[PDB]
Scaffold this motif. Structure first.
Motif, PDB file in Angstrom:
ATOM      1  N   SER A 170       0.818  -1.208   0.000  1.00 33.81           N
ATOM      2  CA  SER A 170       0.000   0.000   0.000  1.00 33.81           C
ATOM      3  C   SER A 170       0.855   1.262   0.000  1.00 33.81           C
ATOM      4  CB  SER A 170      -0.941  -0.008   1.204  1.00 33.81           C
ATOM      5  OG  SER A 170      -2.074  -0.824   0.963  1.00 33.81           O
ATOM      6  N   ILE A 171       2.030   1.215   0.627  1.00 31.20           N
ATOM      7  CA  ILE A 171       2.893   2.390   0.676  1.00 31.20           C
ATOM      8  C   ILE A 171       3.667   2.548  -0.627  1.00 31.20           C
ATOM      9  CG2 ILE A 171       4.807   3.466   1.913  1.00 31.20           C
ATOM     10  CD1 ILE A 171       3.797   1.733   4.375  1.00 31.20           C
ATOM     11  N   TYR A 190      -7.032   3.164  -8.580  1.00 30.03           N
ATOM     12  CA  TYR A 190      -8.293   2.451  -8.767  1.00 30.03           C
ATOM     13  C   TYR A 190      -8.142   0.935  -8.887  1.00 30.03           C
ATOM     14  CZ  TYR A 190     -10.829   6.834  -9.388  1.00 30.03           C
ATOM     15  OH  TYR A 190     -11.411   8.065  -9.191  1.00 30.03           O
ATOM     16  N   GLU A 191      -6.924   0.385  -8.809  1.00 32.53           N
ATOM     17  CA  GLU A 191      -6.758  -1.064  -8.915  1.00 32.53           C
ATOM     18  C   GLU A 191      -7.037  -1.736  -7.568  1.00 32.53           C
ATOM     19  OE1 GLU A 191      -6.394  -2.781 -11.665  1.00 32.53           O
ATOM     20  OE2 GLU A 191      -6.478  -0.876 -12.753  1.00 32.53           O
ATOM     21  N   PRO A 192      -7.650  -2.918  -7.571  1.00 30.50           N
ATOM     22  CA  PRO A 192      -8.089  -3.539  -6.317  1.00 30.50           C
ATOM     23  C   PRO A 192      -6.922  -4.124  -5.543  1.00 30.50           C
ATOM     24  CG  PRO A 192      -8.507  -5.039  -8.119  1.00 30.50           C
ATOM     25  CD  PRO A 192      -7.885  -3.797  -8.730  1.00 30.50           C
ATOM     26  N   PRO A 193      -7.023  -4.168  -4.210  1.00 29.91           N
ATOM     27  CA  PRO A 193      -5.981  -4.819  -3.402  1.00 29.91           C
ATOM     28  C   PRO A 193      -5.849  -6.303  -3.700  1.00 29.91           C
ATOM     29  CG  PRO A 193      -7.345  -3.396  -2.038  1.00 29.91           C
ATOM     30  CD  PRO A 193      -7.995  -3.430  -3.388  1.00 29.91           C
ATOM     31  N   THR A 194      -4.703  -6.709  -4.237  1.00 36.42           N
ATOM     32  CA  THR A 194      -4.437  -8.119  -4.488  1.00 36.42           C
ATOM     33  C   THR A 194      -4.094  -8.845  -3.193  1.00 36.42           C
ATOM     34  OG1 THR A 194      -3.545  -7.462  -6.639  1.00 36.42           O
ATOM     35  CG2 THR A 194      -3.160  -9.731  -5.924  1.00 36.42           C
ATOM     36  N   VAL A 195      -4.660 -10.035  -3.027  1.00 38.54           N
ATOM     37  CA  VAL A 195      -4.258 -10.953  -1.973  1.00 38.54           C
ATOM     38  C   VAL A 195      -3.621 -12.183  -2.616  1.00 38.54           C
ATOM     39  CG1 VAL A 195      -6.213 -10.107  -0.628  1.00 38.54           C
ATOM     40  CG2 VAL A 195      -6.338 -12.347  -1.753  1.00 38.54           C
ATOM     41  N   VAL A 196      -3.077 -13.054  -1.775  1.00 42.32           N
ATOM     42  CA  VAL A 196      -2.439 -14.284  -2.240  1.00 42.32           C
ATOM     43  C   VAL A 196      -3.499 -15.370  -2.389  1.00 42.32           C
ATOM     44  CG1 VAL A 196      -0.694 -16.033  -1.731  1.00 42.32           C
ATOM     45  CG2 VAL A 196      -0.265 -13.630  -1.167  1.00 42.32           C
ATOM     46  N   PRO A 197      -3.484 -16.146  -3.475  1.00 41.76           N
ATOM     47  CA  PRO A 197      -4.420 -17.275  -3.596  1.00 41.76           C
ATOM     48  C   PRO A 197      -4.132 -18.320  -2.526  1.00 41.76           C
ATOM     49  CG  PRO A 197      -2.823 -17.263  -5.401  1.00 41.76           C
ATOM     50  CD  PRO A 197      -2.683 -15.951  -4.695  1.00 41.76           C
ATOM     51  N   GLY A 198      -5.108 -18.538  -1.648  1.00 47.52           N
ATOM     52  CA  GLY A 198      -4.922 -19.315  -0.441  1.00 47.52           C
ATOM     53  C   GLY A 198      -4.875 -18.476   0.816  1.00 47.52           C
ATOM     54  N   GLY A 199      -4.641 -17.171   0.678  1.00 42.53           N
ATOM     55  CA  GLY A 199      -4.440 -16.328   1.840  1.00 42.53           C
ATOM     56  C   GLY A 199      -5.643 -16.310   2.760  1.00 42.53           C
ATOM     57  N   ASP A 200      -5.358 -16.197   4.059  1.00 42.29           N
ATOM     58  CA  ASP A 200      -6.403 -15.928   5.040  1.00 42.29           C
ATOM     59  C   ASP A 200      -6.985 -14.529   4.885  1.00 42.29           C
ATOM     60  OD1 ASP A 200      -6.146 -18.472   6.513  1.00 42.29           O
ATOM     61  OD2 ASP A 200      -4.175 -17.688   7.083  1.00 42.29           O
ATOM     62  N   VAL A 224      -7.460   1.306   2.203  1.00 43.91           N
ATOM     63  CA  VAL A 224      -6.794   2.565   2.512  1.00 43.91           C
ATOM     64  C   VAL A 224      -5.612   2.293   3.436  1.00 43.91           C
ATOM     65  CG1 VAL A 224      -8.403   2.977   4.401  1.00 43.91           C
ATOM     66  CG2 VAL A 224      -7.113   4.908   3.436  1.00 43.91           C
ATOM     67  N   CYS A 225      -4.560   3.101   3.290  1.00 44.15           N
ATOM     68  CA  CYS A 225      -3.393   3.058   4.167  1.00 44.15           C
ATOM     69  C   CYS A 225      -3.010   4.484   4.542  1.00 44.15           C
ATOM     70  CB  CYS A 225      -2.223   2.339   3.496  1.00 44.15           C
ATOM     71  SG  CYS A 225      -0.775   2.107   4.548  1.00 44.15           S
ATOM     72  N   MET A 226      -3.235   4.851   5.803  1.00 43.83           N
ATOM     73  CA  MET A 226      -2.980   6.205   6.282  1.00 43.83           C
ATOM     74  C   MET A 226      -1.583   6.293   6.888  1.00 43.83           C
ATOM     75  SD  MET A 226      -5.090   8.525   9.021  1.00 43.83           S
ATOM     76  CE  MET A 226      -4.053   8.134  10.427  1.00 43.83           C
ATOM     77  N   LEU A 227      -0.754   7.174   6.333  1.00 43.34           N
ATOM     78  CA  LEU A 227       0.597   7.425   6.821  1.00 43.34           C
ATOM     79  C   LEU A 227       0.604   8.768   7.541  1.00 43.34           C
ATOM     80  CD1 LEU A 227       2.505   6.384   3.558  1.00 43.34           C
ATOM     81  CD2 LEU A 227       1.380   4.945   5.261  1.00 43.34           C
ATOM     82  N   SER A 228       0.920   8.753   8.837  1.00 38.75           N
ATOM     83  CA  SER A 228       0.727   9.917   9.697  1.00 38.75           C
ATOM     84  C   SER A 228       1.858  10.000  10.712  1.00 38.75           C
ATOM     85  CB  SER A 228      -0.625   9.849  10.410  1.00 38.75           C
ATOM     86  OG  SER A 228      -0.870   8.538  10.885  1.00 38.75           O
ATOM     87  N   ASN A 229       2.610  11.101  10.669  1.00 41.95           N
ATOM     88  CA  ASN A 229       3.775  11.305  11.534  1.00 41.95           C
ATOM     89  C   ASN A 229       3.339  11.914  12.868  1.00 41.95           C
ATOM     90  OD1 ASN A 229       6.325  11.581  12.585  1.00 41.95           O
ATOM     91  ND2 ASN A 229       7.140  12.808  10.892  1.00 41.95           N
TER      92      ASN A 229
END
Ligand SMILES: Nc1nc2c(ncn2[C@@H]2O[C@H](COP(=O)(O)OP(=O)(O)OP(=O)(O)O)[C@@H](O)[C@H]2O)c(=O)[nH]1
Ligand SMILES: Nc1nc2c(ncn2[C@@H]2O[C@H](COP(=O)(O)OP(=O)(O)O)[C@@H](O)[C@H]2O)c(=O)[nH]1
Ligand SMILES: [Mg+2]
Ligand SMILES: [Mg+2]
Lengths: 155, 491, 424, 423
Positions: free
Chosen positions: D228-229, D343-353, D361-366
């Motif tokens: 995501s980053i 706009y591309e969907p989050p890929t997971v691993v086939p078999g993944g939990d 979303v991934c929020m990066l906040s200092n």
């Protein structure tokens, strides 16, 4: 340090490279060795667009340095009428005092900036304000043979 | 920046003078061939007359520190320097209106005056400047003449008579000069001559000719002067001046020969498989044959058959006890037979001993190291300096710390002259330092800590400034450990 | 960090040594001829650690011990070259093992050690089994250790040293020998498992109800402990994997590296309890001082570090819970200034004859009790100067005894310091 | 345009596998390197034979872990010269990673990096993956970072540190190693994303519904958040398109360069709204570092959405949180939330939990509350260093004891630096 580059620019007067440094999130109120913010330096050397740029990005209009100098002090000392009214319009301290007991009215009177003297006065400057030695702005006109200033101080 | 000392823009010359002034603080006492501001002194003679008051003053303070970096040996070439340098220094340095430009020019002349054997050659060069247009120059360089005298004085001067005449000659005109300062500062020069051999002489030669008011002030000045007619001690000494029954040895006693002492059942006993055979064999010739005596026979006695079997055990013998009693035998030979172990003897036991510092049993390290100290005190640094380094590079941790401690021991007793270009300096940076840093940067602390002394005993010998180069490359954290020992360590 | 070179010295050394090789040969599925007849890869995964045939060197001045090993069950497997044996024996004289007779032979041993190390992909370190009250196992062993320490300073030194007790041999010079040997181990080894014969007798007598324990009975407890502590080393596993990492997480101060081992359940020679213990039961054999192989009470001191090794199929969830439990419910017994000082690891392959087991390696300051016992016996003997002419005759100095006496007492004081230390 | 990744110690190496597994699924790249299908060549180079090779170096002072790389699913993907191994590990000792063992292999490693940088034309900088408590991860990385600040000094370097957690901790001395590397790597890192293994453990037990997670469980979750980053760098988004922008947007103080990353949603494989996931970015339960931002001031804040997202939904969810929560900012900040969308969907691993989600979303906040994490390490450190416990191990492997104190002061100074900003 990005706060130190913004001082270098605001002083030497590179209007464009302030926007560059500020777009990189430089500290608008970054202090140098003696506590001088970029607003101090731009107001000393007469860079009007840099003053208005920093002020609208949240520059401390009434910030002092190590000697109690506000930017309005330095603008009224050097005689930058354009900047004086910008600072005052942004809530500048008309009766600020510095370590030597001077107000901006003292400095504009000493340096003979009669046009700035009148602006400060109309923003409620303290005509009876005294310095360390005990002298008013009016005493300075008496001491310095400036009858043009004596009349402008009693207006 | 090297050739930029003559660049057109002033602020680039101003750099080169600061760069130089660093060079003369930070460069080598022995001195880099880059320090060639001696054999072309026209260079600094040019720099002292810089066309810019700010870059001039910086050239003079570079000349100043140069001209005190040169109080190291051998710079007998200070004659050429005074000729080339003080006329520019007087003419335009003393002349200067600038506070600091002048003060450092005088200090420079001071340092050129004490480079010399006496004051005359410097005096003789700066005398003409008394006859210059500008008063403040003659005002000043009469003050400078007067304080090369009050601090040095006339000694080692070939023909003083000729010199006194030469500096007394202008004193009438100087004392009648228009300038108040030229006069006032001439009565001082008079006093400083009286202060050394007045006043009978000066009243015959010069007091008569001055205004009466003047010679009164000079007499008033002599009363306030207290102290013997020539000063007992000078407030400042020259170059050579500053540095400025035999004892008997008990060794004269008759020699004793031990070859006859040895027994028939010795060779097979030392080369035996039974440890107690070897021990007893060694222990007997040690307690019965060596320990009694106090001087072995220098003349016509070959111990290099006996000494090479002491080595054979000290190196290879598995019995730590037989080692201990052997290294004590080795020491006894080196001690009772001083000035024998030139090479063959010393070298026959040296590298075996350094191998066996690996032994950690206190009694054994005691005996091995003390024997290494013997072979050193009568062969240092013949073979040991090189081979000691070799075994600092060795894989066993113990031999590293012990052979380095050995270099430390030896370095404290390093008193070989000289005065320069000894075996230590030929290989100092190339080998000694490169190898001592390997100890200083070891994985173990107790190893590193031996290097820290062995580097601070090194600086003490050869100047904490010379080695400031690899000091910088070292950790700030290791630096203050090294300095710790430097403050405590002595030679 | 792969291979381990093993050494066994003296009578005891080769006894518990061979017993150890018996145990882990079975566990890894090796027969006495030296051939794999196992049925799992988790057995040959890290067989390269102890085997090539064992990477074992056998040492004794007593030549008889040679045959007592080869005539044993797995005696055929050891390399003939790796047997290094003297002509006479040391006769309970540490000086004979360390300075005179044992020193003559030690070179021959180092030649074999070199040979076995030479052909190692990447050596970890060494492993010596020996007794401390003897002359050979203590005197020559400690001399061997130092001689390796200086020839292999980039490697770990790990000993299984067994402490003498009057309950197992009435020889009164053993306090001398063991004191002199401890003076060596504190300076020369990274980690030392303290096997106390006092505690082995007290376990065989009181817990196992054997009226006269033999060496074989005491050696059974030892060999089972050794396979337990070496489980991490011999099978795949994340935690305490190699010798250095173990010592790094076990030894906070270089001199205080004497571990008090203990394990569970305590079984007799080939008996079976017909009821396998539960996870909370095993866990409650830690403070249980009747399971410590050293005769010390963990209650009387504090744990600096602890390693737990659970062997068998069981709930990793429950083990974590029970260990996290037993720590904080006895929080005053674990030093506070070392956070997460207890570490637990699980191996699925259980030990021989058991469905579950658990070994408890602990750096406990209580171990000072052990060194107290040895020193008091040493001092009682030394103040009357008995049998000193044995040691001094072999080149030793009377001073050495004083230094070893003082150095062991410093070791006791150090343990007492950190026991009374506070985080505040 | 190119970015080089470096993986140090088992942590780096094994998280690397999870990330390059996930990068190749997101880019439709095959295990053998092929592709039936630019912005993505920031991370991959290309062979003449149509093969796409990562711009990556794998480093470990010990074969075992990297041996499994080059005898596994993705053995063909890497060139063998990229996978570097020693023989003796650092044994959980920063000294061995940095001084004793690390110096034996640092030059080979720097050399193999030059071969990847020579293939690149406009190199941006380095991504660095490593543990804290590990000896290799701490010591060797900090050494490598020092030497990269010389041989590539005029460019960026980003950290992906694995903050230690007793639940998976392998060593007692992990506080030591954490402090020691963070001291020596502080000046040489431009930005650094910490990953608390406790938070990743907590998340996997709660939202992935696992009793006792394995490293695979944690690494997969971590690789999702790392993806995501780095998505902005791999697909040419609008925000964070190059490595400098990470410092521009998130780092208003060279030293304080440690962003808190928060990732939603983590859905078990056994859809939410744009507003729901943006609220979860201000829920501590989904942070990667365990702290309480409510106790701290924000210096900056970026939102990296990816998937089925309407730009207006974002502005609504922002105004919701900017009005209906009290996110305190520092006065010398823009105080405006920066946003970017992919706009591309989050890929997971086939078999993944982990389940495929429609948007994420991934929020990066200092935030200054991340100082809490430094305080926990510093405290554990203090207890052990008060007794000089385990210190002989470090000092005996080429390290001066002083370096402990110099590091601790630099951590105390950093805790003051976080305080003065937030008052
Ligand atoms: N999240 C996560 N953490 C890991 C992983 N591998 C190791 N760690 C953590 O990293 C810390 C140090 O372990 P390692 O990174 O394997 O140590 P190393 O870098 O290989 O250094 P040495 O083994 O000592 O040479 C431990 O606290 C582990 O919990 C991983 O794959 N994922
Ligand atoms: N546990 C155990 N202890 C032993 C064994 N043999 C001897 N010991 C102990 O070791 C000490 C005697 O030393 P020993 O090894 O026999 O002498 P060495 O051959 O010279 O090393 C005494 O304390 C004995 O109790 C054994 O087989 N098992
Ligand atoms: Mg025996
Ligand atoms: Mg590792």
């Amino acid at each position: 340090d990005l706060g130190k580059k913004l001082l270098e620019a605001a002083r030497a007067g590179q209007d464009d490279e302030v926007r560059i440094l500020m777009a990189n999130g430089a500290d608008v109120n970054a202090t140098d060795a003696s506590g001088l913010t970029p607003l101090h330096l731009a107001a000393t050397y007469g860079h009007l667009e840099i003053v208005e740029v920093l002020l609208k990005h949240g520059a401390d209009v009434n910030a002092i340095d190590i000697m109690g100098s506000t930017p309005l002090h330095l603008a009224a000392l050097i005689g930058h009428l354009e900047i004086v009214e910008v600072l005052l319009k942004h809530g500048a301290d008309v009766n600020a005092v510095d370590t030597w007991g001077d107000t901006p009215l003292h400095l504009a009177a000493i340096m003979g900036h009669l046009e700035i003297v009148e602006v400060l006065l109309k923003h409620g400057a303290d005509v009876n304000a005294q310095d360390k030695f005990g002298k008013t702005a009016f005493d300075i006109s008496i001491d310095n043979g400036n009858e043009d200033l004596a009349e402008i101080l009693q207006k | 920046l090297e050739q930029r000392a003559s660049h057109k823009v002033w602020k680039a010359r101003l750099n080169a003078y600061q760069e130089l002034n660093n060079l003369f603080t930070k460069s080598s006492v022995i001195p880099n061939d880059v320090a060639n501001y001696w054999l072309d002194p026209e260079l600094f003679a040019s720099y002292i007359v810089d066309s810019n008051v700010v870059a001039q003053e910086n050239a003079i303070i570079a000349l100043h520190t140069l001209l005190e970096y040169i109080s190291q040996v051998p710079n007998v070439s200070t004659s050429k320097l005074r000729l080339q340098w003080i006329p520019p220094l007087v003419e335009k340095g003393l002349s200067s209106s600038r506070a600091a430009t002048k003060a450092k020019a005088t200090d420079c002349i001071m340092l050129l005056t004490q480079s010399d054997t006496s004051i005359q050659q410097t005096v003789n060069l700066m005398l003409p400047s008394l006859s210059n247009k500008l008063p403040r120059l003659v005002s000043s360089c009469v003050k400078c003449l007067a304080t090369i005298i009050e601090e040095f004085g006339f000694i080692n001067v070939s023909d003083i008579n000729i010199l006194l005449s030469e500096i007394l000659e202008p004193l009438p005109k100087l004392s009648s000069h228009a300038d108040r300062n030229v006069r006032s500062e001439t009565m001082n020069l008079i006093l400083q001559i009286y202060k050394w051999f007045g006043k009978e002489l000066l009243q015959e030669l010069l007091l008569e000719k001055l205004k009466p008011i003047q010679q009164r002030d000079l007499s008033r000045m002599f009363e306030k002067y207290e102290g013997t007619i020539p000063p007992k001690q000078q407030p400042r000494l020259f170059q050579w001046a500053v540095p400025a029954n035999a004892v008997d040895p008990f060794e004269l006693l008759p020699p004793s020969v031990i070859l006859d002492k040895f027994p028939a059942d010795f060779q097979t006993r030392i080369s035996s498989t039974k440890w107690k055979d070897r021990v007893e064999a060694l222990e007997e010739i040690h307690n019965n044959v060596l320990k009694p005596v106090k001087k072995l026979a220098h003349k016509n006695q070959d111990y290099s058959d006996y000494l090479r079997v002491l080595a054979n055990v000290i190196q290879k013998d598995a019995n730590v006890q037989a080692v201990t009693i052997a290294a004590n035998s080795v020491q006894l030979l080196c001690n009772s037979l001083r000035s024998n172990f030139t090479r063959s003897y010393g070298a026959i036991v040296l590298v075996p001993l350094l191998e066996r510092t690996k032994e950690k049993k206190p009694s054994v390290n005691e005996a091995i190291c003390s024997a290494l100290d013997a072979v050193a005190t009568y062969c240092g640094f013949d073979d040991c300096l090189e081979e000691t380094l070799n075994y600092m590079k060795h894989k066993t941790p113990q031999v590293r710390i012990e052979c380095t401690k050995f270099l430390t021991r030896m370095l404290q007793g390093w008193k070989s002259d000289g005065p320069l270009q000894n075996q230590l300096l030929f290989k100092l940076l190339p080998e000694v330092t490169t190898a001592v840093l390997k100890i200083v940067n070891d994985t173990q602390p107790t190893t590193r800590n031996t290097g820290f002394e062995c580097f601070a005993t090194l600086m003490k010998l050869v100047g904490e400034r010379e080695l400031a180069d690899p000091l910088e490359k070292l950790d700030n954290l290791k630096k203050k450990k090294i300095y710790e020992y430097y403050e405590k360590v002595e030679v | 960090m792969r291979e381990i070179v093993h050494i066994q010295a003296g009578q005891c050394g080769n006894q518990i040594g061979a017993k150890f090789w018996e145990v882990i040969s079975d566990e890894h599925g090796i027969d006495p001829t030296g051939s794999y007849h196992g049925d799992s890869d988790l057995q040959l995964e890290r067989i390269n650690v102890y085997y090539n045939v064992p990477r074992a060197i056998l040492v004794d001045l007593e030549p008889g011990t040679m045959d007592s090993v080869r005539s044993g069950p797995f005696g055929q497997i050891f390399r003939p070259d790796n047997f290094v044996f003297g002509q006479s024996g040391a006769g309970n004289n540490w000086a004979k093992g360390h300075y005179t007779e044992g020193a003559e032979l030690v070179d021959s041993v180092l030649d074999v050690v070199r040979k076995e190390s030479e052909s190692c992909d990447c050596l970890q370190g060494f492993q010596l089994t020996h007794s401390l009250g003897g002359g050979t196992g203590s005197g020559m062993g400690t001399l061997l250790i130092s001689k390796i320490r200086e020839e292999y300073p980039d490697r770990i030194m790990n000993t299984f040293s067994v402490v003498p007790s009057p309950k197992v041999s009435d020889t009164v010079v053993e306090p001398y020998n063991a004191t002199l040997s401890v003076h060596q181990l504190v300076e020369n080894t990274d980690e030392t498992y303290c096997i106390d014969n006092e505690a082995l007798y007290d376990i065989c007598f009181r817990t196992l109800k054997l009226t006269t324990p033999t060496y074989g009975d005491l050696n059974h407890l030892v060999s089972a402990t050794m396979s337990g502590v070496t489980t991490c080393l011999r099978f795949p596993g994340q935690l305490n994997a190699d010798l250095r990492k173990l010592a790094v997480n076990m030894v906070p101060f270089p001199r205080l590296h004497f571990f008090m081992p203990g394990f569970a359940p305590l079984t007799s020679r080939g008996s079976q309890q017909y009821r396998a213990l539960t996870v909370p039961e095993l866990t409650q054999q830690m403070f249980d001082a009747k399971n410590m192989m050293a005769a010390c009470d963990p209650r009387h001191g504090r744990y600096l570090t602890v390693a737990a090794v659970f062997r068998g199929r069981m709930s990793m969830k429950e083990v974590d819970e029970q260990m996290l439990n037993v720590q904080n419910k006895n929080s005053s017994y674990f030093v506070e200034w070392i956070p997460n000082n207890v570490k637990t690891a699980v191996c699925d392959i259980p030990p021989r004859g058991l469905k579950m087991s658990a070994t408890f390696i602990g750096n406990s300051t209580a171990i000072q009790e052990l060194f107290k016992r040895i020193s008091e016996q040493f001092t009682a003997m030394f103040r009357r100067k008995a049998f000193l002419h044995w040691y001094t005759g072999e080149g030793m100095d009377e001073m050495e005894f004083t230094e070893a006496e003082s150095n062991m007492n410093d070791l006791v004081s150090e343990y007492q310091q950190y026991q009374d230390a506070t985080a505040d | 345009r190119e970015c080089i990744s470096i993986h140090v110690g088992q942590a780096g190496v094994q998280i690397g596998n999870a990330c390059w597994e996930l990068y190749c699924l997101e880019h439709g790249i095959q295990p053998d390197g092929q592709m039936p299908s630019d912005s993505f060549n920031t991370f991959f180079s290309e062979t003449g034979a149509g093969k796409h090779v990562p711009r990556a170096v794998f480093v470990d002072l010990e074969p075992t872990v990297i041996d499994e790389v080059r005898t596994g699913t993705y053995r063909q993907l890497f060139h063998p010269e990229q996978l570097i191994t020693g023989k003796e590990d650092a044994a959980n000792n920063y000294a061995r990673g940095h001084y004793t063992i690390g110096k034996e292999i640092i030059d080979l490693v720097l050399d193999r990096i030059r071969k990847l940088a020579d293939q690149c034309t406009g190199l941006q900088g380095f991504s660095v993956f490593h543990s804290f408590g590990g000896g290799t991860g701490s010591g060797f990385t900090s050494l490598l970072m020092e030497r990269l600040s010389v041989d590539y000094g005029k460019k960026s370097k980003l950290e992906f540190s694995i903050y230690p957690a007793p639940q998976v901790s392998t060593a007692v001395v992990e506080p030591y190693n954490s402090i020691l590397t963070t001291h020596t790597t502080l000046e040489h890192s431009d930005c650094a994303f910490m990953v608390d293994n406790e938070a990743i453990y907590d998340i996997c037990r709660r939202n992935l519904d696992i009793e006792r997670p394995t490293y695979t469980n944690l690494n997969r979750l971590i690789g999702q958040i790392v993806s995501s980053i780095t998505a902005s760098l791999r697909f040419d988004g609008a925000l964070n398109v190059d490595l400098t922008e990470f410092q521009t947007n998130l780092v208003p103080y060279p030293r304080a360069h440690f962003p808190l990353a928060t990732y939603a949603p983590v859905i078990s494989a056994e859809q939410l709204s744009v507003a729901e996931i943006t609220n979860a970015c201000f829920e501590p339960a989904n942070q990667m570092v365990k702290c309480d931002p409510r106790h701290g001031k924000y210096m900056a804040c970026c939102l990296l959405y990816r998937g089925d997202v309407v730009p207006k939904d974002v502005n609504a969810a922002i105004a919701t949180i900017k009005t209906k929560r009290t996110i305190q900012f520092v006065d010398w900040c823009p105080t405006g939330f920066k946003v970017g969308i992919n706009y591309e969907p989050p890929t997971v691993v086939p078999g993944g939990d982990l389940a495929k989600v429609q948007r994420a979303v991934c929020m990066l906040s200092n935030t200054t509350a991340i100082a809490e994490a430094w305080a926990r390490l510093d405290h554990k450190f203090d207890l052990m260093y008060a007794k000089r416990a385990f210190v002989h191990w470090y000092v005996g492997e080429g390290m001066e004891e002083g370096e402990f104190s110099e590091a601790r002061e630099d951590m105390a100074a950093l805790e003051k630096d976080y305080e003065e900003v937030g008052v």
